[PDB]
């Protein structure tokens, strides 16, 4: 009844860890009972996971759950490929992206690439789930293809949303300093997940799809282009050098070696200066 709070999630990690040793069939049953509650809540942004601590507790709970409870990833995928009821408020965007990050870490740490891509193929989520137009509608107001392409376009649209919210958002009008800190921590977790996906070698199909998308264009403005993301990242140099370096690592992981980005963040030649730029 109180599961939407991360302190209750800690109490459940304990309950689960002890029922694991008491009996491994009370364990799996309770793990199923918990996943079946949590995943729809994450889909609808009802969990209070708008903090670093709460997201970490959710991660370790997902790790403590019995694997059988998340074995068919149809539910994880249905609970991840969602849009929020609005993205005009910072808190809703943060809760939505936080639940997405939790489910995504689950997908890249407890499942394999082929299973996830097959299941995505069955339940045909579209890449246009969050297009630039859906994004711009949800920001103020409301209303075939390859599975790896859908997954990669989803993660890239998330990156673009997070960049736009970190760069173009006044620092105490719309969001507090804690909300800004969490936005940057969410972007860091997302970029680290992406680096693991492109660097580990266990997501070759997703990596190839992402390399194809990064070289693609704006389908009449339906998705974020690489130049748009890079223009947003170039403005984070003076404020968030760590996230910018993660973005550079991702650009190398997809072989974007254009000297429009590299000969400028490296200040390639032909007042003390800022330390973040250094």
């Amino acid at each position: 009844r109180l599961i939407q709070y991360h302190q209750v999630l800690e109490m459940f990690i304990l309950v689960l860890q002890q029922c694991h040793k008491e009996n491994e069939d009370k364990w799996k049953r309770l793990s199923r009972q918990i996943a079946d509650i949590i995943l729809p809540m994450l889909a609808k942004q009802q969990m209070h996971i708008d903090s670093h601590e709460a997201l970490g507790v959710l991660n370790t709970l997902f790790e403590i759950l019995a694997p059988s409870s998340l074995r068919p990833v149809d539910m994880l995928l249905r609970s991840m490929f969602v849009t929020p009821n609005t993205m005009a408020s910072v808190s809703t965007v943060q809760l939505w992206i936080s639940g997405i990050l939790a489910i995504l870490r689950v997908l890249i740490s407890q499942s394999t690439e082929d299973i996830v891509l097959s299941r995505i193929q069955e339940l045909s989520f579209s890449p246009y789930l969050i297009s630039c137009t859906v994004i711009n509608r949800l920001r103020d107001g409301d209303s075939k293809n390859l599975p790896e392409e859908t997954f990669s376009r989803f993660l890239l649209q998330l990156v673009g949303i997070l960049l736009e919210d970190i760069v173009t958002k006044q620092l105490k009008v719309e969001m507090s300093e804690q909300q800004h800190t969490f936005y940057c921590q969410e972007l860091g977790t997302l970029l680290m997940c992406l680096i693991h996906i492109f660097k580990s070698g266990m997501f070759r199909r997703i990596t190839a799809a992402a390399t194809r998308l990064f070289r693609s264009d704006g389908c009449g403005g339906s998705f974020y282009t690489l130049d748009s993301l890079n223009l947003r990242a170039r403005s984070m140099i003076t404020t968030h050098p760590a996230l910018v370096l993660l973005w550079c690592q991702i650009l190398l992981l997809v072989n974007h070696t254009d000297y429009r980005w590299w000969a400028e963040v490296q200040q390639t030649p032909k007042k003390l200066g800022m330390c973040n730029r250094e």
């Binding site: 760069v167 009008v173 719309e174 003076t238 404020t239």
Partner: protein
């Protein structure tokens, strides 16, 4: 003879603090003489025959605090309910407020019910020292008893204090403002009562184009200055907060400089601790439109093409700080240094939210260029960096610091 009155009103305080025979009826009604006497030595015609009274009241209280607290509480509530002499009332009231937090949460409802009449009564008391003691006693009493009132009782106390907001005494107006805000704050339904008091105060000045006294205006502006800090996220809405901002902007134009000072202090508290929705309205370009002479058109807070803070800064500058020529400072005879310092502080607090306002031309539609050669800029308030009195040079320094920080924060150092 009075020396032995000091000796008696000190020896009763030498006896009861040391008997070890208490917790028995032989004590309570000797205490019923000690407290009724120490509170009588409190309204004495002689100075030190009252100071020994205060000292021994404090001794008897602090020595028997945990031992016989409820007895002392009743003994002080009685001399409050009596509505007696002023000095005795102050004594009993301030000593009862300092002990309110020691009442166990089963006697806060009887005590609140008994205290409501006494409080409404002593609010109608014309003495100024009584009003000071009440301004200090109302927050302490509410912070301990307000969770035990119903909304009707709280509204009774609130209407009891709203009346003093038109009083001619400044002490009485300040006590009213503070007591109303503190009553709203320490209530069960805090946000609803904040909105209720907002309704009452904005209703007290519904048409700004209508005579509203000078004393009522001062009282309402002070109450709003006290209430604005508490509005950091029914609940009060952008509608009435924007109406409060409009009221403040209108009353900075008043001809009485006390109303100008009150409105500048309200605008200061409103830019330094802005409710999160009024902030968004003031910084939004559409803004409110979507929901000492001026000499020219500076614009309207309802304009588009610019956020309302641009107009607010234009208003403050064109009113109290800039003539309209070029590097010409407004004399002190036209507007005093207090109003000038407060206007510079308000401009700094507004620039903290919206640096672009600092760079505006002083006038949207310029003054007639035949005689005024060059258009003045708001930024010329910086010429006050060498005004001549402190607190105006210091305010200009504060404004430069705030402006540097705000420009570096708005652009990502992409200055």
């Amino acid at each position: 003879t009075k020396k032995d009155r000091v000796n008696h009103c000190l020896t009763i305080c030498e006896n009861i603090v040391a008997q070890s025979v208490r917790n028995s009826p032989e004590f309570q009604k000797l205490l019923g003489i000690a407290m009724e006497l120490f509170l009588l030595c409190s309204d004495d015609a002689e100075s030190d025959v009252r100071m020994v009274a205060d000292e021994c009241l404090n001794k008897v209280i602090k020595a028997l605090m945990d031992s016989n607290l409820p007895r002392l509480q009743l003994e002080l509530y009685k001399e409050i309910k009596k509505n007696g002499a002023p000095r005795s009332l102050r004594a009993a009231l301030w000593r009862f407020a300092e002990l309110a937090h020691l009442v166990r949460p089963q006697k806060c409802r009887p005590y609140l019910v008994n205290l409501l009449p006494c409080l409404t009564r002593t609010s109608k008391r014309p003495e100024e020292s009584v009003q000071e003691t009440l301004a200090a006693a109302v927050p302490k009493i509410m912070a301990s008893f307000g969770n035990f009132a119903n909304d009707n009782e709280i509204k009774v106390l609130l209407k009891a204090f709203i009346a003093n907001l038109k009083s001619s005494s400044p002490t009485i107006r300040r006590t009213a403002a503070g007591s109303a805000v503190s009553i709203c704050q320490h209530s069960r339904r805090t946000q609803y009562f904040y909105s209720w008091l907002l309704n009452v105060l904005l209703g007290l000045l519904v048409p700004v184009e209508d005579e509203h006294s000078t004393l009522l205006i001062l009282g309402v502006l002070l109450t709003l200055r006290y209430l604005v800090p508490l509005l950091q996220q029914v609940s009060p809405s952008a509608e009435q907060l924007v109406q409060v901002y409009e009221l403040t902007l209108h009353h900075t134009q008043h001809q009485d400089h006390n109303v100008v000072t009150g409105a500048l202090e309200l605008l200061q508290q409103l830019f330094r601790t802005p409710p999160p929705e009024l902030l968004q309205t003031l910084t939004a370009v559409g803004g409110i439109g979507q929901l000492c002479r001026i000499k020219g058109d500076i614009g309207q807070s309802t304009d588009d093409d610019s956020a309302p803070l641009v107009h607010c800064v234009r208003l403050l500058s064109a009113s109290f700080l800039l003539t309209g020529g070029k590097n010409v400072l407004v004399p002190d005879r036209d507007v005093r240094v207090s109003v000038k310092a407060l206007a510079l502080s308000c401009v700094g607090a507004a620039v903290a939210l919206h640096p672009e306002s600092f760079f505006s031309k002083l006038y949207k539609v310029p003054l007639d260029t035949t005689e005024y050669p060059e258009e003045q800029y708001v930024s010329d308030i910086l010429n006050y960096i060498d005004h001549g009195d402190p607190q105006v040079r210091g305010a200009t320094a504060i404004l430069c610091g705030t402006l540097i920080c705000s420009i570096l924060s708005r652009s990502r150092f992409h200055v």
